[PDB]
Design a protein around this ligand. Structure first.
Ligand SMILES: OC[C@H]1O[C@@H](O)[C@@H](O)[C@@H](O)[C@@H]1O
Ligand SMILES: OC[C@H]1O[C@@H](O)[C@@H](O)[C@@H](O)[C@@H]1O
Ligand SMILES: OC[C@H]1O[C@@H](O)[C@@H](O)[C@@H](O)[C@@H]1O
Ligand SMILES: OC[C@H]1O[C@@H](O)[C@@H](O)[C@@H](O)[C@@H]1O
Lengths: 418, 417, 416, 416
């Protein structure tokens, strides 16, 4: 069965994408974007998070490029929010969480600042007259506090006043740095952004993960030595789970293929390890995490021997798996990847898609029934673009640049025989 | 006005197709696919029919090839049903009807086995790893019990244990054999299937129908002699109506054009009678059955002088008419066929389409008001692909193969030359 | 940001178009098309208006050409209606308004007859076997009573019997004559239709509007001299507002560019003033009417110095502005026009589109909140095709002909 | 076998088209275009003929629209020529033939003036700044002297001073009037040219030819009564052959289908007889004139019982047959027309194409061997566009307009 690069499948994806764009519109709050619950209501107690606001700015940049009325107003809202309450006008950068009445979390989180970077870079592709100013400012914050020239890797977090950095180094924030750096590169061609991306991946993936059967180590000390037992007593942490989180492995895989494609796009032969390691991560994710416990789905985390720990099926791991299947199919022409993509789509409509309340469920238990454990509500639509829009685009340039360039369905041009 | 081979019209068709796919999803039951009612609910008392289950397997094969998440799971469900409760594990083939408790109708119905053949052949086009095995098994059953080598025609039915065949021969079962054989040909490229289809059409249409003003005779004895009086006392029978059923005539017309196109595809000149007789069937259907009684719509049945008998407007006849209009337009380029297609679409949205309760009504009275008489519920969506998907495809290969091949919209200043 | 001539934007446009076609279907009544309210219900007390019936005939002609089942039945219904109760079978032409009991308004309104002409011409593009007959008759009525050979302009209205014409000449009726004449030209090529359209535009726009900073004068006496203070006492009139109605200025702009494109289509160099004056009208509209009073949106009317009078934001002016932005973008390649189009789409979804009850609101107050003041319900869908379908087509031939020709998306990018 | 609307066939067509364009370029002379011989040199003794200069103006208009460097210079050359020595500044219109020291044939030939009209209308499609002026003037001459309002038909010829008209009416000149009128229509979108074309075809074809087994009568007296024995003593005349000339019958067929398509293009139902009679003419041409005498090819003339008179195979009849086969295929979708087109292409390359000396031979004997009898030289490339370019275009608008519109290969399969 052929779905990739078919207009019939791609029309289905677009129509679902519009349903998703509609869901996120409910998140608009004066200081940015709020946290949506299971019925698409704002959970006011959660306030305005930096990472959510930046993600929505990115999402509505893509929607704007797709020619959807109202989306550009959300881009504008996003850019205003990044210049408003979220912005620390004393020490620079952005607070982690604010609301109409003040700052709740003033800390300076690297993970969230890389999303700020992605949001600004994607906003630039819309031509919004204030987007490039925002990007330039974000670059200054990143280079001052979050890219380490000494370590040639990303730092994790600081206090409000940028006086003390966290005694921890994280694969997760570094992963989203790679993601953001790809798009910054697409809207600058300052070579350093791609160089930095390759460097980060070489350390986290080609060195550490590859040497552990492609089980990505996320937690390191300040000297970049793995802390294997980090969070052993808080294993279901939302951002720093104990052990391996296979959803991240497979996401890394796709990011490495965007890097491969960006190198190809400047007529450079990419290093072979990008594709090799992307295959490795994909294979490892299925090996350990797909249906390991008597029911379909991807578990949330595994121990260092591949045994599941948190068995809940969170939404984003399978969504990322679908994106990576597409990226691997694109580079390999191997139908096995398409078969996995299809299998996962069937699972998604069966268990995760929520036509009744809107969007998709965020989390299921080990029997694939809606649960509340790891998460609380439906606060994200950003990951969904990776299974809804990415499969309609080349791998270079990246998501927002490629949509703005008019590349949707560009490759959808007798597929049962040769 | 141009609709055929326009992306605007074809987009509308696709959007309606998705509405129809959605309606059929609630038919899923442990033993296969159940019988949906007017509001999309399962009518439990009807059980799990072989023909319905096989048709759904076919429909969701097309949906799967169209890239709809969930459709492949329904293909898988259908294949499991065909390997499970519906399959006669003792004597082979498939029971006509089952439920959770056991067998409701143990008979071995040719009509329904030809749908099993279609369903398996369409499933093959999805690449499902169990589909070819199913097709192989279905072919074995068909050649053992339902294609007669001596008659060079299809048998009608057997009892559960295949001890004796029915003393009756049917144009209806044979029509759906042609339909299935076309698709088996597409997934085998073995001319024997097309040889058989052409042979069947040559007897029922080119001989008997053509010599009867294109009024197709459906009921025959075992020597393939017409029984003109069959079911006089049960005229509104769902599968064996008394007299002629014009919806069937026009359906035969399309099938003959698929056959024509299949021959052309391998650079063989089709016999001229396929097109000639398709024209005759289409014309005769309009002649006897279109608006014959002071209101629009196709009547269900007519006597041998063309006079209406059962005057209800059932859904499938007009749907088939629309499919045949497309096929004839494709072969002739004659705009009259497109005009009919358009007129029929307008009728369908006015009277048949049911946006309130789902799908389309199954049956209307002679004033085009919803009724319950010949039928009971909304158990079919298979026919609707003939007015929704067929117009988006060439005539060769057939429906499911062509969608799998990526041919949707391939043919799409058209107000002048 | 690129939207014009992109399949992603055009798909969004088509899907909204279908939503709009669905809303109008509820307007069917035995005598034509009735007046839809905010819920898509018929407002029976409004009866069956000639202008509404003719507009719906036009709208469903386009829907039919787009391959929508049922639309042709609505064309058929409109044609029957134009041969039924609405037709004055005694004196000729069509009554302004009828109902199931008889004639409500027997007068013969030029404005509404030009819509009859448009409807018939659009219907011809469907091939409906009674459409050409309707067009031919409509042309006869227009040439007898509405196109003046002595004035080389359109007359305004008459009594039922066509015995006395109104002592008034109108820019508004003449504008919609231009619109109708373009489509009659498309389905005939009697040159006179384009000649007449150019003549009308040359008087109302090139002479009078251009000389008044592109503020179109609508109200004239029988000698075609402006009546500047017409309807001072009734400034929010639905068809003859006091002063300038900027939505009409921008509508004139687009029509002139359809005229331009028609001339190009036959390998003729169009007169330069069509584009020059389209630019002038567009600019003047932004200058006087866009967000002139501390909130977004187009006001309804302005005085002769460009100051707002009626500040309500009616639906059709912004819808027409979007159409004209597309036309100007097409001719100039200047992205400022695309930027305006996008800005206005954002405003429309924010304030005008009504996904709850259907269609779009007809009218908002000066703070962009839905109101009832100038208008009453949701009786029109015709204008919406100018921001939904027009951006998917070339400028020649016109709307219904172009859709019938299969030209949707024919023209459908961050660097050179 | 499928050729029509295939890119592979159309590429072959374009490549031959370029070889043909190249051959014509040597015809440039100071006063217009000269008469090319068998090896592509100028037959200087023939001087500059109006019909040749006008045809070359048309051909290079098409070449220019196709983006061939040098072609526009020839369009400019042709326009200058039509304003130079060929132009009668005293009495108006154009002399039939001039040379570098004066007028050779001062007569005012209708046949040649309809080609002047075609050449000007085609030149307008290139946007050359002097082309519209030329067309406008040519129209004035045609309407003064060559279209008769009284007869509703075209006259044949006049003396230099337009004092007396020839006591003769010709189906040939009228055929080329139809041809020219189609293109004038295309660059004016004005009804009257099509009305005139339809009227002309209705008389020559629907009345006279249809009632004589589709054998077109060409020679008429001043009352439009046939002269059946005209040119009995000069049967092989180049423009007025005795009896019927089947090449002309099949050419009429295509022109009627361009007429049909033009009507369709403005959403008008064309009269059924255009297609009926086009089929009739095509069939009759094969019936009487295709391989009638034991070898392939179309004879030049037949008598009124269909028997061949002049048996030479001149180039243009089969070239026109091929164009008509395309037009009939386009309207009917009947493969028999494509089969004939293919058969004729095979004959053309076997016997007519001249890769050695350039272009195609003008004339063969009854055994398909190159001969000199009816004609002398290779002065024409105009007909060749009817088998080289026409099969790559829709039937409306006509040749030069369609190429200028970007329509080449727009329509470009073993089963249904
Ligand atoms: O959407 C939130 C999730 O995003 C993924 O890419 C990872 O960064 C996870 O750690 C995180 O919980
Ligand atoms: O959908 C069921 C119908 O299918 C048609 O093709 C015919 O076989 C009818 O006899 C039958 O009732
Ligand atoms: O839709 C109704 C409106 O149409 C516009 O084009 C103008 O004619 C207005 O005066 C009128 O109120
Ligand atoms: O090319 C010259 C020829 O052109 C044809 O169309 C006819 O007019 C002939 O009579 C003429 O000899």
């Amino acid at each position: 069965m052929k779905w990739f690069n078919t207009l019939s499948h791609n029309r289905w994806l677009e129509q679902e994408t519009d349903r998703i764009f509609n869901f996120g519109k409910n998140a608009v709050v004066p200081t940015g974007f709020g946290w949506l619950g299971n019925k698409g209501q704002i959970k006011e107690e959660m306030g305005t998070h930096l990472w959510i606001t930046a993600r929505m700015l990115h999402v509505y940049s893509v929607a704007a490029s797709m020619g959807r009325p109202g989306a550009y107003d959300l881009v504008d809202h996003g850019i205003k929010a990044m210049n408003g309450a979220l912005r620390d006008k004393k020490y620079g950068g952005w607070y982690a969480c604010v609301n109409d009445q003040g700052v709740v979390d003033a800390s300076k989180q690297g993970y969230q600042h890389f999303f700020a970077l992605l949001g600004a870079a994607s906003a630039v592709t819309t031509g919004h007259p204030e987007a490039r100013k925002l990007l330039d400012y974000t670059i200054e914050v990143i280079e001052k506090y979050f890219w380490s020239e000494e370590e040639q890797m990303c730092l994790e977090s600081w206090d409000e006043a940028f006086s003390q950095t966290e005694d921890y180094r994280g694969g997760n924030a570094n992963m989203h740095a790679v993601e953001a750096f790809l798009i910054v590169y697409d809207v600058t061609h300052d070579k350093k952004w791609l160089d930095r991306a390759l460097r980060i991946a070489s350390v986290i993936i080609h060195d550490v993960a590859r040497n552990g059967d492609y089980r990505v180590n996320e937690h390191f000390d300040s000297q970049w030595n793995p802390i294997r037992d980090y969070n052993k007593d808080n294993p279901a942490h939302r951002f720093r789970a104990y052990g391996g989180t296979p959803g991240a492995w497979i996401e890394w895989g796709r990011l490495m293929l965007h890097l491969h494609a960006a190198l190809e796009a400047r007529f450079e032969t990419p290093p072979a390890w990008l594709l090799e390691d992307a295959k490795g991560l994909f294979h490892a994710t299925i090996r350990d995490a797909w249906a390991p416990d008597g029911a379909d789905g991807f578990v949330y985390s595994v121990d260092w021997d591949g045994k599941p720990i948190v068995r809940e099926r969170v939404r984003w791991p399978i969504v990322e798996a679908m994106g990576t299947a597409y990226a691997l199919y694109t580079l390999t022409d191997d139908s096995q990847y398409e078969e996995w993509y299809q299998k996962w789509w069937d699972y998604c409509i069966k268990y995760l898609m929520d036509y009744e309340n809107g969007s998709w469920w965020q989390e299921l238990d080990a029997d694939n029934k809606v649960t509340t454990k790891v998460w609380d509500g439906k606060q994200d639509i950003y990951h969904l673009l990776h299974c809804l829009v990415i499969p309609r685009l080349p791998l270079a340039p990246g998501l927002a640049p490629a949509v703005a360039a008019g590349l949707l369905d560009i490759n959808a041009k007798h597929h049962h025989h040769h």
